[PDB]
Write a protein that binds this ligand. Structure first.
Ligand SMILES: CCN1/C(=C/C(C)=O)Sc2ccc(OC)cc21
Length: 339
Protein backbone atom coordinates (compact mmCIF):
# COMPACT_ATOMS: atom_id res chain seq x y z
CA UNK A 1 0.00 0.00 0.00
CA UNK A 2 1.59 3.27 1.35
CA UNK A 3 5.38 2.84 0.67
CA UNK A 4 4.57 2.16 -3.08
CA UNK A 5 2.53 5.31 -4.25
CA UNK A 6 4.27 8.39 -2.75
CA UNK A 7 7.86 9.11 -4.19
CA UNK A 8 9.47 12.55 -5.23
CA UNK A 9 8.44 13.49 -8.79
CA UNK A 10 5.10 11.46 -8.75
CA UNK A 11 2.20 13.60 -10.12
CA UNK A 12 -1.22 13.03 -8.37
CA UNK A 13 -4.75 13.87 -9.78
CA UNK A 14 -2.90 15.18 -12.91
CA UNK A 15 -1.72 18.32 -11.05
CA UNK A 16 0.14 17.70 -7.69
CA UNK A 17 3.92 16.98 -8.08
CA UNK A 18 5.51 15.53 -4.90
CA UNK A 19 8.72 17.42 -3.87
CA UNK A 20 9.14 16.40 -0.11
CA UNK A 21 7.77 14.37 2.90
CA UNK A 22 6.29 16.50 5.74
CA UNK A 23 5.15 13.67 8.15
CA UNK A 24 4.32 9.94 8.61
CA UNK A 25 2.17 8.03 11.13
CA UNK A 26 -0.03 4.90 11.41
CA UNK A 27 -2.60 7.13 9.57
CA UNK A 28 -0.39 7.36 6.40
CA UNK A 29 1.88 10.18 5.12
CA UNK A 30 1.71 13.95 4.42
CA UNK A 31 3.71 15.11 1.32
CA UNK A 32 4.57 18.63 0.02
CA UNK A 33 3.47 19.17 -3.65
CA UNK A 34 3.64 21.83 -6.44
CA UNK A 35 0.05 22.49 -7.75
CA UNK A 36 0.57 22.89 -11.56
CA UNK A 37 -3.12 24.06 -12.00
CA UNK A 38 -2.91 26.89 -9.37
CA UNK A 39 0.19 28.79 -10.70
CA UNK A 40 2.70 26.47 -8.87
CA UNK A 41 1.34 27.09 -5.34
CA UNK A 42 2.86 24.60 -2.78
CA UNK A 43 0.25 22.49 -0.83
CA UNK A 44 0.25 19.60 1.69
CA UNK A 45 -1.42 16.29 0.61
CA UNK A 46 -2.35 13.64 3.25
CA UNK A 47 -2.29 10.14 1.69
CA UNK A 48 -4.43 7.89 4.00
CA UNK A 49 -3.55 4.22 4.78
CA UNK A 50 -6.08 1.93 3.00
CA UNK A 51 -7.33 0.45 6.34
CA UNK A 52 -11.09 0.56 7.39
CA UNK A 53 -10.53 2.72 10.56
CA UNK A 54 -8.42 5.43 8.77
CA UNK A 55 -10.70 5.38 5.63
CA UNK A 56 -13.74 6.00 7.92
CA UNK A 57 -11.75 8.79 9.84
CA UNK A 58 -10.72 10.53 6.52
CA UNK A 59 -14.37 10.50 5.20
CA UNK A 60 -15.49 12.03 8.59
CA UNK A 61 -12.63 14.62 8.45
CA UNK A 62 -13.67 15.72 4.84
CA UNK A 63 -17.33 16.26 6.09
CA UNK A 64 -16.11 18.28 9.23
CA UNK A 65 -13.66 20.47 7.15
CA UNK A 66 -16.37 21.23 4.50
CA UNK A 67 -18.61 22.50 7.36
CA UNK A 68 -15.88 24.39 9.33
CA UNK A 69 -14.22 25.98 6.20
CA UNK A 70 -17.68 27.16 4.88
CA UNK A 71 -18.68 28.50 8.35
CA UNK A 72 -15.30 30.35 8.74
CA UNK A 73 -14.12 31.19 5.18
CA UNK A 74 -11.53 33.79 6.47
CA UNK A 75 -10.00 31.18 8.92
CA UNK A 76 -10.57 33.71 11.76
CA UNK A 77 -10.70 30.69 14.23
CA UNK A 78 -7.46 29.04 12.85
CA UNK A 79 -8.64 25.59 11.76
CA UNK A 80 -6.53 24.08 8.88
CA UNK A 81 -8.05 24.87 5.41
CA UNK A 82 -8.93 21.91 3.11
CA UNK A 83 -8.64 22.80 -0.69
CA UNK A 84 -10.10 19.48 -2.05
CA UNK A 85 -9.84 15.64 -1.92
CA UNK A 86 -9.43 12.83 -4.53
CA UNK A 87 -8.46 9.07 -4.78
CA UNK A 88 -4.98 7.76 -5.92
CA UNK A 89 -4.53 3.94 -6.53
CA UNK A 90 -7.71 3.71 -4.31
CA UNK A 91 -6.18 5.80 -1.43
CA UNK A 92 -8.14 8.83 -0.09
CA UNK A 93 -5.96 11.97 -0.55
CA UNK A 94 -6.80 15.31 1.19
CA UNK A 95 -5.21 18.60 -0.07
CA UNK A 96 -4.57 21.42 2.51
CA UNK A 97 -2.94 24.89 2.62
CA UNK A 98 0.84 24.40 3.35
CA UNK A 99 1.80 25.22 7.01
CA UNK A 100 5.03 24.65 9.07
CA UNK A 101 6.29 22.06 11.68
CA UNK A 102 3.85 20.61 14.28
CA UNK A 103 4.50 21.88 17.85
CA UNK A 104 5.72 18.28 18.62
CA UNK A 105 8.29 18.25 15.71
CA UNK A 106 9.56 21.76 16.74
CA UNK A 107 10.16 20.52 20.36
CA UNK A 108 11.89 17.32 18.98
CA UNK A 109 14.23 19.33 16.65
CA UNK A 110 15.01 21.67 19.60
CA UNK A 111 16.38 18.69 21.67
CA UNK A 112 13.06 18.46 23.71
CA UNK A 113 13.63 21.96 25.28
CA UNK A 114 10.41 23.79 26.37
CA UNK A 115 8.92 27.01 24.88
CA UNK A 116 9.56 30.38 26.64
CA UNK A 117 6.49 31.66 28.60
CA UNK A 118 5.60 34.55 26.19
CA UNK A 119 5.22 32.06 23.25
CA UNK A 120 3.19 29.68 25.50
CA UNK A 121 0.68 32.54 26.26
CA UNK A 122 0.09 33.37 22.51
CA UNK A 123 -0.06 29.65 21.60
CA UNK A 124 -2.49 28.84 24.51
CA UNK A 125 -4.79 31.81 23.54
CA UNK A 126 -5.00 30.73 19.82
CA UNK A 127 -5.63 27.01 20.74
CA UNK A 128 -8.53 27.96 23.19
CA UNK A 129 -10.04 30.36 20.52
CA UNK A 130 -9.92 27.70 17.72
CA UNK A 131 -11.28 24.81 19.87
CA UNK A 132 -13.94 27.14 21.40
CA UNK A 133 -15.17 27.73 17.75
CA UNK A 134 -15.52 23.90 17.35
CA UNK A 135 -17.44 23.74 20.68
CA UNK A 136 -19.83 26.60 19.37
CA UNK A 137 -20.56 24.27 16.40
CA UNK A 138 -21.67 21.32 18.63
CA UNK A 139 -18.35 19.46 17.96
CA UNK A 140 -15.71 17.90 20.26
CA UNK A 141 -12.20 17.27 18.75
CA UNK A 142 -11.34 14.31 21.15
CA UNK A 143 -7.62 13.92 20.02
CA UNK A 144 -5.86 17.24 20.76
CA UNK A 145 -2.04 16.83 21.15
CA UNK A 146 1.19 18.67 20.19
CA UNK A 147 1.42 16.66 16.87
CA UNK A 148 -2.07 18.14 15.85
CA UNK A 149 -1.20 21.85 16.62
CA UNK A 150 0.67 23.20 13.54
CA UNK A 151 2.86 26.38 13.31
CA UNK A 152 1.87 28.64 10.32
CA UNK A 153 5.61 29.25 9.64
CA UNK A 154 8.41 27.58 11.76
CA UNK A 155 11.38 29.92 10.86
CA UNK A 156 13.69 30.30 13.97
CA UNK A 157 16.83 32.03 15.28
CA UNK A 158 19.39 29.99 17.28
CA UNK A 159 21.81 30.97 20.14
CA UNK A 160 23.81 29.30 22.97
CA UNK A 161 21.96 29.56 26.32
CA UNK A 162 24.76 29.52 28.98
CA UNK A 163 22.01 29.22 31.68
CA UNK A 164 21.20 25.55 30.70
CA UNK A 165 24.40 25.05 28.54
CA UNK A 166 22.16 24.17 25.52
CA UNK A 167 21.89 25.64 21.94
CA UNK A 168 18.24 26.85 21.70
CA UNK A 169 15.93 27.61 18.74
CA UNK A 170 13.28 30.45 19.16
CA UNK A 171 10.38 30.99 16.71
CA UNK A 172 10.15 34.29 14.78
CA UNK A 173 6.31 33.88 14.69
CA UNK A 174 4.58 31.38 17.06
CA UNK A 175 1.10 31.62 15.29
CA UNK A 176 -0.70 28.13 15.12
CA UNK A 177 -3.64 26.29 13.42
CA UNK A 178 -5.53 23.20 14.73
CA UNK A 179 -5.57 20.02 12.49
CA UNK A 180 -6.60 16.28 12.47
CA UNK A 181 -10.50 16.32 12.53
CA UNK A 182 -10.74 12.55 11.80
CA UNK A 183 -12.13 11.73 15.38
CA UNK A 184 -14.25 14.92 15.83
CA UNK A 185 -17.81 14.04 16.98
CA UNK A 186 -21.10 16.07 16.91
CA UNK A 187 -23.28 16.29 20.08
CA UNK A 188 -26.09 14.17 18.55
CA UNK A 189 -23.96 11.36 17.00
CA UNK A 190 -22.61 8.10 18.57
CA UNK A 191 -19.80 8.67 21.15
CA UNK A 192 -16.97 5.97 21.10
CA UNK A 193 -15.90 4.70 24.58
CA UNK A 194 -12.18 5.11 23.71
CA UNK A 195 -11.10 8.66 22.59
CA UNK A 196 -7.82 10.73 22.91
CA UNK A 197 -4.11 9.64 22.85
CA UNK A 198 -3.05 8.13 26.25
CA UNK A 199 -1.16 11.13 27.79
CA UNK A 200 -4.02 13.63 26.91
CA UNK A 201 -7.04 11.43 28.00
CA UNK A 202 -9.57 12.85 30.60
CA UNK A 203 -10.69 10.94 33.75
CA UNK A 204 -14.40 10.80 32.65
CA UNK A 205 -13.10 9.01 29.45
CA UNK A 206 -10.94 6.47 31.44
CA UNK A 207 -13.91 5.81 33.86
CA UNK A 208 -16.48 5.65 30.94
CA UNK A 209 -18.77 8.20 32.69
CA UNK A 210 -19.77 9.82 29.31
CA UNK A 211 -17.77 12.68 27.66
CA UNK A 212 -18.41 15.88 25.65
CA UNK A 213 -16.60 19.27 25.05
CA UNK A 214 -14.83 19.25 28.53
CA UNK A 215 -12.53 16.26 27.56
CA UNK A 216 -10.96 18.76 25.01
CA UNK A 217 -10.25 21.18 27.95
CA UNK A 218 -8.37 18.38 29.87
CA UNK A 219 -6.26 17.57 26.73
CA UNK A 220 -5.35 21.33 26.35
CA UNK A 221 -4.24 21.46 30.06
CA UNK A 222 -1.85 18.48 29.43
CA UNK A 223 -0.56 20.18 26.20
CA UNK A 224 0.29 23.44 28.12
CA UNK A 225 2.34 21.39 30.76
CA UNK A 226 4.35 19.68 27.91
CA UNK A 227 4.97 23.14 26.26
CA UNK A 228 6.22 24.46 29.68
CA UNK A 229 8.46 21.44 30.68
CA UNK A 230 9.34 19.73 27.33
CA UNK A 231 7.99 16.39 28.77
CA UNK A 232 4.59 14.84 29.88
CA UNK A 233 3.81 14.57 33.65
CA UNK A 234 1.96 11.28 32.71
CA UNK A 235 4.78 9.06 31.23
CA UNK A 236 2.75 5.78 31.07
CA UNK A 237 1.02 3.30 28.69
CA UNK A 238 -1.47 1.83 31.30
CA UNK A 239 -4.99 3.10 32.33
CA UNK A 240 -4.63 2.26 36.09
CA UNK A 241 -1.04 3.63 36.29
CA UNK A 242 -2.39 6.85 34.67
CA UNK A 243 -5.09 7.16 37.42
CA UNK A 244 -2.36 6.61 40.13
CA UNK A 245 -0.21 9.44 38.55
CA UNK A 246 -3.36 11.71 38.55
CA UNK A 247 -3.83 11.06 42.34
CA UNK A 248 -0.12 11.87 43.07
CA UNK A 249 -0.13 15.10 40.92
CA UNK A 250 -3.70 16.43 41.44
CA UNK A 251 -5.12 14.74 44.61
CA UNK A 252 -7.67 11.94 45.23
CA UNK A 253 -10.44 11.20 42.66
CA UNK A 254 -13.88 12.51 43.69
CA UNK A 255 -15.94 9.88 45.59
CA UNK A 256 -18.99 10.33 43.19
CA UNK A 257 -16.79 9.35 40.12
CA UNK A 258 -15.42 6.16 41.83
CA UNK A 259 -18.95 4.99 42.92
CA UNK A 260 -20.70 5.71 39.54
CA UNK A 261 -18.00 4.01 37.32
CA UNK A 262 -18.64 0.60 35.66
CA UNK A 263 -14.76 0.38 35.42
CA UNK A 264 -14.57 -1.69 38.67
CA UNK A 265 -11.30 -3.35 37.41
CA UNK A 266 -9.30 -0.23 38.62
CA UNK A 267 -10.78 -0.29 42.19
CA UNK A 268 -10.63 -2.29 45.46
CA UNK A 269 -13.77 -1.16 47.39
CA UNK A 270 -13.80 2.72 47.18
CA UNK A 271 -10.05 3.26 46.32
CA UNK A 272 -7.59 2.57 43.44
CA UNK A 273 -6.38 -1.11 43.41
CA UNK A 274 -2.73 0.13 43.73
CA UNK A 275 0.39 -1.45 45.33
CA UNK A 276 2.73 1.52 46.17
CA UNK A 277 5.61 -1.05 46.61
CA UNK A 278 5.25 -2.86 43.15
CA UNK A 279 7.45 -1.97 40.11
CA UNK A 280 4.75 0.43 38.74
CA UNK A 281 4.18 1.79 42.32
CA UNK A 282 7.90 2.67 42.81
CA UNK A 283 8.04 4.33 39.33
CA UNK A 284 4.93 6.50 39.95
CA UNK A 285 6.14 7.81 43.33
CA UNK A 286 9.68 8.54 41.87
CA UNK A 287 8.34 10.23 38.68
CA UNK A 288 5.25 12.15 40.02
CA UNK A 289 4.71 14.92 42.63
CA UNK A 290 2.23 17.78 43.34
CA UNK A 291 1.55 19.88 40.18
CA UNK A 292 2.86 23.26 41.51
CA UNK A 293 6.26 21.61 42.42
CA UNK A 294 6.96 21.45 38.61
CA UNK A 295 7.01 25.32 38.47
CA UNK A 296 10.42 26.70 37.26
CA UNK A 297 9.76 30.20 38.79
CA UNK A 298 7.45 31.86 41.42
CA UNK A 299 7.09 35.03 39.22
CA UNK A 300 3.36 35.98 39.01
CA UNK A 301 3.09 35.14 35.24
CA UNK A 302 4.18 31.53 36.16
CA UNK A 303 1.48 31.57 38.93
CA UNK A 304 -1.14 32.79 36.37
CA UNK A 305 -0.29 29.89 33.90
CA UNK A 306 -0.45 27.27 36.76
CA UNK A 307 -3.84 28.66 38.02
CA UNK A 308 -5.29 28.14 34.44
CA UNK A 309 -3.67 24.61 34.12
CA UNK A 310 -5.14 23.60 37.57
CA UNK A 311 -8.66 24.80 36.47
CA UNK A 312 -8.35 22.87 33.13
CA UNK A 313 -7.41 19.67 35.13
CA UNK A 314 -10.54 19.87 37.46
CA UNK A 315 -11.64 16.16 37.82
CA UNK A 316 -15.44 16.92 37.62
CA UNK A 317 -16.14 17.67 33.92
CA UNK A 318 -19.20 19.96 34.67
CA UNK A 319 -17.21 22.07 37.25
CA UNK A 320 -14.19 22.22 34.79
CA UNK A 321 -13.57 25.68 33.23
CA UNK A 322 -15.03 26.12 29.65
CA UNK A 323 -12.80 27.53 26.84
CA UNK A 324 -15.13 30.62 26.78
CA UNK A 325 -14.20 31.14 30.51
CA UNK A 326 -10.48 30.31 29.79
CA UNK A 327 -10.14 33.14 27.17
CA UNK A 328 -11.04 35.61 30.04
CA UNK A 329 -8.42 34.14 32.52
CA UNK A 330 -5.79 36.61 33.89
CA UNK A 331 -2.87 34.70 32.14
CA UNK A 332 -4.13 36.33 28.83
CA UNK A 333 -4.37 39.95 30.26
CA UNK A 334 -0.81 40.68 28.87
CA UNK A 335 -2.17 39.92 25.29
CA UNK A 336 -5.00 42.47 25.78
CA UNK A 337 -2.83 45.43 27.05
CA UNK A 338 -3.33 48.38 24.63
CA UNK A 339 -1.41 48.20 21.29
C1 LIG B 1 2.05 16.56 9.19
C2 LIG B 1 0.99 17.44 9.81
N1 LIG B 1 -0.19 17.72 8.95
C3 LIG B 1 -1.37 17.05 9.08
C4 LIG B 1 -1.55 15.92 9.83
C5 LIG B 1 -2.79 15.23 9.92
C6 LIG B 1 -2.83 14.00 10.78
O1 LIG B 1 -3.82 15.58 9.30
S1 LIG B 1 -2.62 17.78 8.10
C7 LIG B 1 -1.49 19.00 7.52
C8 LIG B 1 -1.75 20.11 6.72
C9 LIG B 1 -0.73 20.97 6.37
C10 LIG B 1 0.56 20.72 6.82
O2 LIG B 1 1.52 21.57 6.32
C11 LIG B 1 2.86 21.38 6.74
C12 LIG B 1 0.82 19.65 7.69
C13 LIG B 1 -0.22 18.79 8.05
Amino acid sequence: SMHLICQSGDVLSARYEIVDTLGEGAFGKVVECIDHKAGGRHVAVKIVKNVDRYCEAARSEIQVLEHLNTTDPNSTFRCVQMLEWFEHHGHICIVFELLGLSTYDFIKENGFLPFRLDHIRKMAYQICKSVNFLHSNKLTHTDLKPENILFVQSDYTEAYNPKIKRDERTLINPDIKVADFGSATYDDEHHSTLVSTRHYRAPEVILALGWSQPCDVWSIGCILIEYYLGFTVFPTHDSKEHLAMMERILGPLPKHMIQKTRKRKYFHHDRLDWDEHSSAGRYVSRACKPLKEFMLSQDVEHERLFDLIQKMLEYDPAKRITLREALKHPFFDLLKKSI
